[PDB]
């Protein structure tokens, strides 16, 4: 899901782009005793197979000269030992599970006093997993007031 | 009325000077090299977005973007010093040479709390460039051993060089997540003694007085410009035969006697090799 | 230089260099309390110039001066256990001794 | 998708799923909507209530971090690709491995969640990995915390543990998890019932 | 000044490089184009250009040049001399035209007129 969201990468208009393929994860090299005692991580590596196209000029869809593939490596994501924990620097860390509020539409008031009259005021506010805000206040005026971020 | 930050005023200031053709240029650098300082400032006030779109690249290193700018100004002011339009080339590739190398100086220079010289950032950028291309060959880390072993370098030359990479930390930062703890709260004073090892060195040294005017004087004179003790200064055996007694084997004979005399008086007070350097 | 790890430390007599071995590391098994080397290291340094009271100290007992100062691993103050369990890391090129 | 469907459940629409961004008629919709809630057609909702409260775990805060190192990839490529070359050149030198490393290691090390296993019990271990804490990224903190986060609620019955928060700054922030409770496919707690018939 | 007088030395300026600021007086202003080299050789300082030099009076009325030809010295000053040679006479003559085609719209462009000197009947270029 994260490669497909941010591949393709395409260059400034260049007629090139890089996409990607399939990834595959590697065996780790020392197992979870041998990394507490050694201090290390207990990870695995990543060896992303990508493919660099090369679009052609006077060719805005139309073929590719050069396409090369090319496993190449990055990251390394710690593997979750058997009973989920985790071996960061030879320590044994917990990822504590966070509650944070739905995105999505949220239709708040406001019901304090908030204007010296006691007037609630609602307000909408539309949070998404990665964006920006928005809002739609109401105004004691009885006025509708976006605001955004 | 423009919002007063300084790098929008900046950039929105250095759009008014319309670019130069390459005629245009040729003429306006035959007049500024004969010493006319309207074509310099005429030649340097245009190039400025190239300034700005050269050190674009250079962002997100120690420097800051403005830096950054002002930096590779001054590299371009260099530029129009030593221009050829004899040459007939297009000034933008001679001034790129410039404004590239006076901001790689720049962040090669301004960037570590601790100085490191040019020779030894460009060797590290070496070993780094180094590591990266091997990352991908054997998939982890690669070890000073690993890089000692792809440039046929010795392994303590690497080693040295990446200890040379420390990223010198902060202080005020907290420690262990929670604000409450920073390194302030952690270091301790080291060459500032403490009031134990300060008086007890006070007392050793009225001790030593007193148990040196418990030894006899001519013993005790000889300790004392020996090692510069009581108010002396710390005098040759030569130096104080000639000074003193003139047979500088017996002022070695003296000596040996005040140091037996002595090594009775601290052994009477319990204090012996095992009680004094434990 | 480097710091050493050996068992022959300054101003430290054979009271507490009876629980290292031989290569400054000490016996698994060994009942360690409150103050006693584990560790022995030898950390070098230079330029001493020393006040003449010490000078005359040395003098007195024939003491040599040290240019190795102590920075040996000692238990901490008040934990007396038992060390059951050594492990010694090398970097790769450095010579293991006779413990590792 | 999970904005999507709470999005199209709470402007009552009949799909949930769609775009993951906004269009013309969601905007609209939402400020109908708003204005009949001013009227006195519908009522306002509460955040507390565990219908509006999701919980993120390992897979979606690490897939979010390995999302914020490819982006920084993402970057210097199209920095790599079109300046310069064309080239023939080959990807494997594109592509820096340390940036990916240090943000999933920067989110693994050290964190606000990535805390120590406090590993003196079986007890201890457990009830440290089934922690739903309200604090982090994206999270509140406790200087900010209101009397309601706190408290309470009506919705928390054989989801979260009601006796079980550490007392102190954060009180009723570090709610474990009950025993039965499961967790959706969005990520809401559910619970088990077992399904009365006729009787 | 007793005219406008100073944006029309921005004008001159935004014509490009052709005016020299501290050459100009009073209803008076000066302008050169140095375009031709006398060698390659020597440092940018000692090159001397092959290049014209014209004054100018202002009035009212119309403006006034009287043009000349020359080389550009070491010194700093300008020499009626011109070297004999058809191609950079070419050079001097085209860009000349070309500053002059200029002029002329911008004097246009705040109608006025341009009018030769008494003493512009002795140079031999077209204008």
């Given at each position: 899901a994260a490669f497909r969201s941010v591949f393709p990468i395409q260059s400034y208009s260049g007629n090139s782009e890089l996409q990607y393929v399939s990834y595959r994860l590697g065996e780790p090299v020392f197992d979870v005793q041998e990394c507490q005692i050694r201090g290390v991580t207990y990870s695995a590596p990543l060896r992303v197979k990508l493919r660099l196209v090369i679009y052609e000029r006077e060719a805005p869809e139309g073929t590719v000269k050069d396409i090369k593939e090319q496993e190449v490596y990055m990251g390394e994501i710690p593997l979750m030992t058997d009973n989920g924990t985790f071996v960061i620097n030879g320590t044994e860390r917990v990822i504590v599970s966070q509650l944070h509020r739905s995105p999505g539409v949220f239709f708040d008031?406001?019901?304090?006093?908030?204007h010296s009259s006691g007037k609630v005021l609602y307000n909408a506010r539309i949070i998404p997993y990665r964006g920006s805000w928005l809002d739609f206040e109401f105004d004691p005026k009885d006025n509708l007031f976006v605001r955004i971020d | 009325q423009r919002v007063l930050d300084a790098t929008q005023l900046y950039l929105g200031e250095i759009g008014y000077s319309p670019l130069l053709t390459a005629e245009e240029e040729v003429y306006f650098a035959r007049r500024a090299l004969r010493g006319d300082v309207a074509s310099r400032r005429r030649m340097i006030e245009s190039n400025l977005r190239l300034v700005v779109k050269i050190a674009r690249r250079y962002g997100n290193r120690g420097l800051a973007l403005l830096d950054l700018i002002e930096e590779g100004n001054l590299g371009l002011i260099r530029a129009v010093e030593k221009f050829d339009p004899e040459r007939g080339f297009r000034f933008s590739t001679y001034a790129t040479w410039w404004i590239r190398q006076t901001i790689e100086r720049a962040i090669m220079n301004q960037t570590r709390t601790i100085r490191l010289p040019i020779h030894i950032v460009k060797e590290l950028n070496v070993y780094l460039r180094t590591a990266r291309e091997l990352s991908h060959k054997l998939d982890h880390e690669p070890s000073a051993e690993e890089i000692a072993e792809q440039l046929d370098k010795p392994v303590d030359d690497v080693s040295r060089m990446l200890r040379l990479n420390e990223r010198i930390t902060s202080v005020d930062t907290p420690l262990g997540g929670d604000s409450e703890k920073a390194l302030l709260d952690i270091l301790a004073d080291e060459k500032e003694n403490g009031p134990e090892d300060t008086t007890q060195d006070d007392d050793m040294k009225q001790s030593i007085v007193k148990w040196l005017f418990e030894l006899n004087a001519k013993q005790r004179e000889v300790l004392a410009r020996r090692f510069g003790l009581l108010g002396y200064e710390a005098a040759t055996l030569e130096d104080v035969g000639r000074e003193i007694g003139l047979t500088r084997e017996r002022v070695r004979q003296i000596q040996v006697e005040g140091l037996r005399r002595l090594r009775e008086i601290l052994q009477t007070q319990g204090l012996n090799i095992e009680a004094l350097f434990r | 230089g480097p710091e050493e790890i050996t068992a022959d430390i300054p101003n430290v007599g054979e009271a507490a260099l009876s629980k290292l071995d031989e290569s400054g590391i000490v016996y698994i098994g060994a009942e360690v309390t409150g103050g006693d080397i584990l560790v022995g290291k030898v950390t070098p340094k230079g330029e001493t110039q020393l006040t003449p009271e010490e000078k005359l100290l040395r003098a007195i007992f024939g003491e040599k001066a040290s240019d190795v100062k102590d920075s040996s691993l000692r238990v901490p103050n008040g934990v007396s256990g038992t060390v059951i369990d050594v492990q010694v890391f090398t970097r790769d090129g450095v010579e293991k001794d006779k413990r590792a | 998708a999970v904005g999507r469907m709470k999005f199209n459940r709470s402007l009552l629409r009949e799909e949930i799923e769609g775009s993951g961004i906004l269009s013309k008629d969601d905007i609209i919709d939402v400020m109908k909507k708003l204005i009949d809630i001013r009227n006195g057609k519908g009522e306002v909702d509460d955040i507390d209530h565990l219908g509006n409260r999701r919980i993120r775990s390992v897979g979606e805060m690490a897939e979010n971090q390995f999302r914020v190192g490819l982006v920084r990839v993402e970057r210097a490529v199209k920095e790599r690709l079109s300046l310069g070359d064309l080239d023939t050149l080959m990807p494997q030198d594109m592509i820096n491995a340390k940036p990916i490393s240090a943000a999933v290691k920067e989110f693994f090390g050290s964190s606000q969640l990535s805390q120590f296993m406090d590993q003196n019990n079986p007890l201890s271990e457990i009830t440290h990995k089934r922690r739903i804490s309200a604090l982090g990224p994206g999270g509140l903190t406790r200087?900010?915390?209101?009397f309601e986060v706190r408290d309470v609620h009506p919705t928390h019955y054989g989801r979260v543990c009601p006796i079980e928060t550490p007392e102190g700054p954060n009180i009723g922030l570090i709610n474990s998890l009950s025993v039965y409770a499961q967790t959706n496919e969005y990520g809401f707690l559910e619970t088990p019932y077992r399904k009365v018939t006729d009787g | 000044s007793g005219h406008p007088k100073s944006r029309l030395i921005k004008k001159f300026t935004a014509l490009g490089p052709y005016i020299r600021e501290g050459q100009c007086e009073d209803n008076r202003f000066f302008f050169d184009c140095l375009a031709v080299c006398v060698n390659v050789k020597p440092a940018p300082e000692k090159r001397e250009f092959w290049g014209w030099w014209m004054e100018l009076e202002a009035q009212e009325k119309r403006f006034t040049y009287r043009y000349q030809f020359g080389l550009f010295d070491k010194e700093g000053n300008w020499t009626v001399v011109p070297i004999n040679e058809t191609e950079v006479v070419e050079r001097l003559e085209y860009t000349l035209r070309e500053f002059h085609e200029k002029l002329r719209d911008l004097l246009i462009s705040m109608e006025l007129a341009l009018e030769p000197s008494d003493d512009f009947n002795d140079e031999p270029v077209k204008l």
């Open positions: 008031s406001d019901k304090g006093k908030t | - | - | 200087e900010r915390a209101g | -």
